[PDB]
Symmetry: C2
Subunit: 214 residues, 2 copies
């Protein structure tokens, strides 16, 4: 399915989220290029100020755009699932803090790639790093190891994101991933991310850029 990822591909991302009863919705549009890894998206919270800081949704808000090199093309499960797409399920444990349960389907709708996500977060501490918005507006580089899932015919991944916090400590988020096709050897995805803001935009937003290679 890599046949569909040569050159720039338009992207739509919709996240239906519920953290501790706090209902919110995020829409993102942009382009992705998987020849260089470039991911460029802008997200908008159509339901007010987010109850949760933007950097925690980064891992939830398209690894199909990883810049798999010539000797690692056989291992790209993500593109190969397209245009049928795949289902991405994740469990995110914020240490000493609440937890995420995310189900995501990444599929082609026409010529555009769509990532429709449902998120549920419970047992989060108010006045803490997540609900208290104490997390820095950053996302540092992380390696994500991908392995093959023998039972369900897809891939699984686990990694720990280190969120920088304003006072100076470090907030950790343990990730557990499961990808399943709708219709690979041990390698990793090295990711870089920049977070910016659009000054003409007053709705709570996030502009991100990403470089992903394997």
């Amino acid at each position: 399915g890599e046949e569909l990822f040569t050159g720039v591909v338009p992207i739509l991302i919709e996240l239906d989220g519920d953290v501790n009863g706090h209902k919110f919705f995020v829409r993102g549009e942009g382009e992705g290029d998987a020849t260089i890894g470039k991911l460029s998206l802008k997200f908008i919270a159509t339901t007010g100020k987010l109850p949760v800081p933007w950097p925690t949704l980064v891992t939830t808000l398209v690894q199909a755009f990883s810049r798999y090199p010539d000797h690692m093309k056989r291992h790209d499960f993500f593109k190969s699932a397209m245009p049928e797409g795949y289902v991405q399920e994740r469990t995110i444990y914020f240490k000493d803090d609440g937890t995420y349960k995310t189900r995501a389907e990444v599929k082609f709708e026409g010529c555009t790639l769509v990532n429709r996500i449902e998120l549920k977060g419970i047992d989060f501490k108010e006045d803490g790093n997540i609900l208290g918005h104490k997390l820095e507006y950053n996302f540092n580089s992380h390696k994500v190891y991908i392995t093959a899932d023998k039972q369900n015919n897809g891939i699984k991944a686990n990694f720990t994101i280190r969120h920088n916090v304003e006072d100076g400590s470090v907030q950790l988020a343990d990730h557990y991933q499961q990808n399943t096709p709708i219709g690979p050897d041990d390698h990793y995805l090295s990711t870089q991310t920049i977070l910016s803001k659009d000054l003409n935009e007053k709705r709570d937003h996030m502009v991100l850029l990403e470089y992903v290679t394997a």
Copy 2:
């Protein structure tokens, strides 16, 4: 229909040309937006300096990216033919000179819109405006009158490009269009396409080329 023309669409253009025996090939790539009417393309002559000046190829080298406003959406024949596409057959008469006959298939091939063109030119003067490269590297604003052709289930168009000549004269090029859908399920009253075009060059680029930017909108009604 028009749904494939919301937002930026990638474009590939390939020209197989035969003018007075002088064989050439032109390849073009870029993007189009039909919400604002913007075309951004770069063409390369992969076979040496063209026997004919670039401007003469402008009209031949995807009117589907014209910016039909919401109240003239019904009249957009080009978009309605997609993704199966349409055939553009054109005859171009240069006054006191030779003539172009172009057959082109503009269709969606995957997520890219492709314009494959066959061009044949005869009876051109070696000592004239075209073969002599007397035409300036520009393209002035032109209106393209569209009427509905019910018999061929498409559209026909007539317009005349005024090509500037270096001495100060004007070379005229009479155009005659006929567009035919490749499938079925695609007819607009008399309206026109007002077009602006800039022809530029990339200094990094060693091959005979042409970079253009174009703004096409629909009006008259």
